[PDB]
Design a protein around this ligand. Structure first.
Ligand SMILES: C[C@@](N)(C(=O)O)c1ccc(C(=O)O)cc1
Ligand SMILES: C[C@@](N)(C(=O)O)c1ccc(C(=O)O)cc1
Lengths: 452, 452
């Protein structure tokens, strides 16, 4: 299984999802799925870029090149682990100083277990689950994204502003939905709120179960109107379906967690029984520096991304004349000229990534200053680099985000919360779209009442 | 780092302590200490033997040779993990079916985390800590030795027989002492007992801290006389010194956990302020079959124990003429004739080891019978060997011990308890010695009142 890699004085490891996960029965032999641009090639190319930017920089790590080892996680604990092994062992015998990723929280956990056995700092960028806050269990983990605790807090803070003294509650099964809700309900009593009805359900349960859900919900009115949905995307979708089936439309005000966010694939077709709701989404600004880089990527200049070729073909559905990385699903030829701009969309979570890395540099920068006073490069004290220590440095590290955000960690490795309040409405144009209306900057709730 | 290995159809892994742990500052580069006979070469040599006996047996695993991979643990989490890696990796790509050891509980925990990530069964023999009973955390662990929970139980049961309605309590710092005590204290209330005083202390704390401890203890009399010592050996020794210093002798009746047991190096010199106490010690009978084998080990015939040579030198303090494994600490020459019988002592925990192994075979035998009915060797269903399943079979396994004991595991992988009750007294001869007075066969307390 191929592996991205750049050389340097201090090597940072990374676990991005280059391909899709292995199908059901392919889990044993560990064969992954088709390549991914979104959660993959872009994540990878990003590393490199960010690394070039840091290394070229004259303030941060002056005379200490930064290198990296990028392995494919395949968004599955099994592969992620397989790789993670190579990481530690190559190390136990140039060694890894730290790891970025993996994406999924369920995974990140698995990875953290295998990583703390060798005292290796793991910074994440999308794994928000509420367990990763228990250091007594996940000591070496830390992320640049708020946990989901801060999700309930912000959703509640929303219900507060609109003086609603009576709501409903629905959540999906799994360590995501359960933890979040329980978290909210906890904020219910203490704050002074009453929960009319409440239920749960998997995202795959039959349409029947859904209808049943709607029923139990409707029966509680005209009091239980506001439905707090710490729900996975597909669960909300399934609810709207339940309304379209029962021919009823607009009987509640939805308020969903980020599982819903602004995902266009959750309301397609039901842009009606949905309209009006409010979604909480992780506030992650765009990033220009990265487009100017990526888009101008050529097929013969990208020599560090062993994947690119495979990807380039899948991305443009064409094949290369007798190339070790040729695809059998295409017939035409790649002019090696097609422009990556077409139908281009920047990974929603980019910012976090770049930052997670940058937080990994600063950890070192700050370690150097302390254990190598007067030294220009890496002093004996950091050869090798002590795991446990780099950890402190990391935590007690603070800096300016790549987009201008404030970055730091609490005592558990948790980052400050900062979301966006999305509202799905009919634009003055001619389409139902998610419109940015409010923000959440750490307990401070803002909303342009004139936008809702 | 060398590795003992024997070939076969199913390979069993093992983590014995061949050398001592790495010094304080040598922990980074992971260099261990001098070789060990007691906890090492004999443990290893044992493997081979036991394996030879099973393989030669006509009843157990018929036409399925058993092989093994023995790696040095150096009684330290760090090396043990390093090796544990090789195990899984060599496997993720002949693989290991299971793991025997490591020695220390503190370590076996560590090793258990890295081993359940790859569904690999670990059977222990000396790791009694009370945590290893939590499967929601250490699912893949199991041992042939009672936990320490049954230590308090049996210690209390002792205090019971002597109707004492008022005792004292002292315990050493560490997952050993704390958990044991608490465990006892838990049995205090429910049963109806009161604890006069109570304190704790590291085994290295200054003589001062010790004196202070004796003080706090003496001050509580003539009621707080019976001192329940769930203590590490050196802690007890330390107390006896505190008494010799303060010139006081015989003011309390000690009752110590196995940390003390019948260790001669705990009371040497203080054979006075110690006499009278009672220790709980693990019932592990001798084993002849192993002596007949070990003692007849020659330097040119032992080809599977890559260590032997090194060991042979340190064991007789002599060196071999220009040998890749020559020691610089000796001057004479090994006649290669010296008899291993001199000053020979059989590993006190032997029985357990052998049995751990035998319980590793019985797990497989039992798996074979079920998933390969009628097949003679290893049927397709066992190639490769599914970890998870080997687990069930193991647990649900039962058998006759190597010395005639009964062996089985409960629902959490715990083995039945069975200790000996030691009493330090002055034999009718002329010496203070530990005398076997009573037993503890699972809740049934026996003592020859005429021996105490
Ligand atoms: C459920 C999730 N909040 C978690 O497990 O942390 C999660 C959601 C979406 C994504 C994603 O598609 O990027 C990843 C993770
Ligand atoms: C700390 C210990 N009580 C445990 O981990 O259970 C322990 C102590 C000594 C030994 C030994 O050397 O035999 C084994 C284990």
């Amino acid at each position: 299984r191929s592996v991205a890699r750049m050389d340097g004085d201090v090597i940072i490891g990374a676990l991005f999802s280059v391909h899709h996960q292995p199908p059901a029965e392919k889990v044993p032999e560990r064969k992954c799925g088709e390549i991914r641009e979104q959660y993959g090639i872009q994540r990878v190319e990003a590393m490199f870029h960010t690394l070039d930017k840091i290394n070229a920089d004259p303030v941060l790590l002056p005379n200490i090149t930064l290198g990296s080892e990028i392995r494919d996680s395949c968004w599955h604990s099994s592969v992620a682990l397989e790789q993670s092994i190579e990481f530690i062992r190559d190390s136990l015998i140039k060694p890894i100083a730290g790891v970025i990723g993996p994406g999924s929280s369920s995974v990140a956990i698995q990875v953290q277990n295998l990583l703390q056995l060798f005292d290796i700092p793991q910074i994440a960028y999308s794994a928000t689950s509420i367990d990763l806050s228990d250091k007594t269990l996940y000591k070496y983990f830390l992320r640049v994204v708020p946990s989901d605790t801060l999700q309930a807090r912000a959703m509640l803070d929303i219900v507060k502003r609109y003086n609603w003294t009576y709501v409903s509650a629905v959540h999906t099964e799994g360590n995501y939905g359960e933890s979040g809700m329980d978290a909210f309900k906890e904020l219910a009593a203490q704050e002074g709120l009453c929960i009319a009805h409440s239920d749960k359900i998997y995202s795959n349960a039959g349409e029947k179960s859904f209808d049943r859900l709607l029923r139990k919900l409707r029966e509680r009115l005209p009091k239980a109107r506001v439905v707090v949905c710490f729900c996975e995307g597909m669960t909300v979708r399934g609810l709207l379906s339940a309304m379209r089936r029962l021919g009823v439309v607009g009987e509640f005000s939805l308020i969903g967690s980020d599982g819903w966010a602004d995902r266009d694939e959750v309301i397609e077709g039901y842009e009606v029984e949905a309209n009006g709701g409010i979604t909480i989404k992780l506030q992650s600004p765009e990033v220009r520096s990265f487009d100017d880089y990526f888009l101008k990527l050529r097929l013969d200049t990208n020599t560090r991304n062993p994947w690119f070729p495979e990807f380039w073909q899948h991305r443009f559905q064409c094949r290369l004349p007798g190339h070790l990385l040729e695809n059998p699903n295409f017939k035409k030829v790649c002019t090696g000229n097609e422009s990556l701009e077409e139908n281009y969309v920047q990974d929603s979570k980019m910012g976090f990534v770049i930052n997670a890395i940058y937080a990994m540099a600063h950890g070192l920068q700050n370690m150097h200053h302390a254990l190598c006073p007067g030294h220009v490069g890496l002093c004996d004290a950091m050869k090798p680099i002590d795991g446990r220590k780099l950890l402190d440095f990391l935590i007690k590290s603070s800096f300016v985000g790549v987009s201008g955000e404030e970055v730091w960690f609490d005592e558990k490795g948790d980052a400050p919360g900062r979301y966006d309040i999305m509202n799905l409405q009919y634009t003055e144009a001619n389409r139902y779209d998610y419109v940015h209306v409010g923000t959440w900057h750490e307990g401070v709730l803002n909303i342009d009442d004139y936008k809702i």
